[PDB]
Amino acid sequence: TPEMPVLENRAAQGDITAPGGARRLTGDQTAALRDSLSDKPAKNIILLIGDGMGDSEITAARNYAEGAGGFFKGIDALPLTGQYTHYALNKKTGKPDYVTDAAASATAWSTGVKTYNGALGVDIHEKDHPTILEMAKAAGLATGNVSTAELQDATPAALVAHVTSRKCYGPSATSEKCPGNALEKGGKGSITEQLLNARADVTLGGGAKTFAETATAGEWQGKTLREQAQARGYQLVSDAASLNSVTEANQQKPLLGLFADGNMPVRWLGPKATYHGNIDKPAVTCTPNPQRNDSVPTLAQMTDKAIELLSKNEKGFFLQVEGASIDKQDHAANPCGQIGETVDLDEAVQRALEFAKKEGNTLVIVTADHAHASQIVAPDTKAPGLTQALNTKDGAVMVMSYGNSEEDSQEHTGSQLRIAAYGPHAANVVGLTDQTDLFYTMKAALGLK
Amino acid sequence: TPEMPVLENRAAQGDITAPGGARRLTGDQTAALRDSLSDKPAKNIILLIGDGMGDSEITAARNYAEGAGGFFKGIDALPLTGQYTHYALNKKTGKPDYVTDAAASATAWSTGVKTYNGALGVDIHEKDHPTILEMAKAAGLATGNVSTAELQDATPAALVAHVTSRKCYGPSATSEKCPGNALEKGGKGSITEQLLNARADVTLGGGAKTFAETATAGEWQGKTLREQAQARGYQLVSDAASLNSVTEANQQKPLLGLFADGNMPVRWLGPKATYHGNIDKPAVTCTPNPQRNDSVPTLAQMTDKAIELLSKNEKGFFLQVEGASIDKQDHAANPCGQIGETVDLDEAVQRALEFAKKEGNTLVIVTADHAHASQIVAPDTKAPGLTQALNTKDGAVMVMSYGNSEEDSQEHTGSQLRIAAYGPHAANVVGLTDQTDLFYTMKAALGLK
Ligand SMILES: [Mg+2]
Ligand SMILES: [Mg+2]
Ligand SMILES: [Zn+2]
Ligand SMILES: [Zn+2]
Ligand SMILES: [Zn+2]
Ligand SMILES: [Zn+2]
């Protein structure tokens, strides 16, 4: 069919010190872009969330990994781009809370309604709203939700659970934090419980431990959430090997991948940024993480199988893939960790585009939930916060900075950030939009009511 | 002719607390976007540089001025969008310097070659390269260069001067800082002298004092740079009233507007951010600047007249307009002063679009040289640097942070930033591009050799 181009090379054209050497473009876009514009309907949609992966996160990753004139074959390759707003809401006044958390933002792009920090699937009135995933499942479409964080953490949970607070993981915490939701108290239940009820075809990530809890009320009272899964049809896999033995993954044989007690281990090791570290200490070179066992699947691997299983549905599918720890390491002021994670995601995003071009009716979207702390500063910056110099692909030093908190956790920031898309309806992310528009853009491309 | 739509409303559709209330989109873009793609040649081009106005600077200003669900009629209204890279070069190794200054960046978009921080119109070998303005003048097109900074400052000087350091304002400093350029030493000369030789039709800004210097060598030796200007044909205006009396402005009657000794006064007052200021001090509300005399033209006012004068050329024109102090107040950790300047810029950008739509073959581009320091943080952020909470249009507090420097000057940052465009060839800004492409995009739109 009329193939929509996917940016093949936005890397520098040559000698960056020479005239025309640093150009990313080779010729005029007008035609190429025009060939990317389609209001055909998406058969499927894959949405890649780089948790806290704003433009600075992207630059620092490219800069370190592929060099300043380099180019991410996935993240940088989506043709249509824009910047979106992601403000949350103050619960009491319903006023904008300029800086959102994982909870409110996820709810935003999945239900189309703004909310307060810490909420999952509810508007500020605590009223429920159906998720893009739920709507899909009803339409007969296959659903998938992948992530490197515990499956209970906001971003993935936002598509299946409806709770007043995000801390309402499983049984124990919900009873004493989300009573109105508590199963025993007559509510729908904990995030975990609600996820198992949700029943999406493919659900992979960490968070094994919240499955150790036993239900209190309900049909499965007494038994651990784990057994309830199995008992209800769920195939349980815990490693690369078992993950590959799957062939079918459908409403009767849903796949539940629990690859870590909590979050999946980080891709790279590197010390954490320190006070004056860019000046008092040697420049860092990132290293692979010894701890991460070779049996723990990688985001791209997870993304790959999901796609392979999900693609079987004649109607189509929906898949959320999250590279969660970009944000986490960003909170930890740990460059190597964070950068490596963005790389991890780029890899997954590559795997998504590859399929996007072959199939031809897919919508690929890459973006973040919000902006974060890290900033690329000058080698000699003498800062008040946490810094650290890194040796980049170019053989140059690059200095990173964390200084928007004295609390030991570096904070999110409120800046608008990038949203790139490729395929049918990819046009709706261009210019300035709001994260809730993302929701509407998925519903309409997918032709959902 | 086929009119290209200019984003009329990306404000929220309604109640931000309700489902679909926070949306900026009202329908599908595909067609509207289609109707914006043209490879027709631009008759003219207007380039709006918000010095240091990256996405965080845009959000903070829209948040405070128009509210989070608000929309900038100028800045936010340009249909086509993308993110570009602006790294500079190390002079010694020709390696990437991840964080450029005003000088190198300006040089990148105007000549099309990367350079080291502090250079104006030279590559790292100190070899000269023609500017887009210079090329335009030769092509027979009208030229204009507008700024709120002293005309000598990098951003506006980059289009007419070729100096080893940006500190080579006029006579004195050049002799002792850019010997190879110094007139008497045989060189082309100081930035001022080079500007006066450049002879662009319209040149308005600040920097009156560098014109008090007297040339040393040359035809006009002994006399002050100012008399030389008059002696050569320049119409010298110094206020709104004189600026409006101009009718012609061309090669024989070139206009030179010097509206301030140095930089033009800022638009808004507001105190400077302080340590723990968001917690220790009351929330601030910006105020207009009392100092700013009513006779000092405003950026939009200046942009307006430039356009009016420049529009007279049957061939076309080229116009660089810079809102300079966004960056200057940003260095100063002064939210009210910084936001005010971004607003000041939006006003001028509106002017540009207004014309852009009427004429029909204009290319408008709005962007910044680099990213800067400010960050929108949480009301209760307990930070190491400079903070300050402000009362926004929403009636909510918005906290801003400055903490990438213990030096009393807040630093630039290397993050990739937005670049929106409207008109012929506006497509070439979509996706990831590099600041030097911007140079090639102007050259081909304007059909220059
Ligand atoms: Mg997450
Ligand atoms: Mg400037
Ligand atoms: Zn997040
Ligand atoms: Zn976070
Ligand atoms: Zn600057
Ligand atoms: Zn600056």
Swiss-Prot record, chains A, B:
Q: Which SMART domains does the UniProt entry name for this protein?
A: alkPPc
What Enzyme Commission number does this protein have? 3.1.3.1
Which cofactor is recorded for it? Mg(2+); Zn(2+)
One Pfam assignment: Alk_phosphatase
Q: Its principal location? A: periplasm
The highest taxon in the source lineage is Bacteria
- Which GO CC annotations does the UniProt entry carry? outer membrane-bounded periplasmic space; periplasmic space
Q: Which cysteines are joined by disulfide bonds?
A: 168-178, 286-336
Which note does the record give on the cofactor? Answer: Binds 1 Mg(2+) ion.
Q: Which GO molecular function, any one, fits this protein according to its record? A: magnesium ion binding
Q: Which keywords does this Swiss-Prot/TrEMBL entry list?
A: Disulfide bond, Hydrolase, Magnesium, Metal-binding, Periplasm, Phosphoprotein, Signal, Zinc
Where Mg(2+) binds, per the record, is at: 51, 153, 155, 322
One GO term under biological process is: protein dephosphorylation
- Which residues act catalytically here? 102 (phosphoserine intermediate)
* Binding-site residues, Zn(2+) 2: 51, 369-370
Query: Which Gene3D superfamilies does its entry note?
Result: Alkaline Phosphatase, subunit A
**List of residues binding Zn(2+) 1:** 327, 331, 412
Location comes to: Periplasm
Q: Record's InterPro entries?
A: Alkaline_phosphatase, Alkaline_phosphatase_AS, Alkaline_phosphatase_core_sf
Question: Its catalytic activity?
Answer: a phosphate monoester + H2O = an alcohol + phosphate
Its quaternary organisation is:
Isozymes 1 and 3 are a dimer of identical chains, isozyme 2 is a dimer of heterogeneous chains, one of each of the subunits from isozymes 1 and 3.
Family listed: Belongs to the alkaline phosphatase family.
What is the protein name for this chain? Alkaline phosphatase
Gene for this chain: phoA
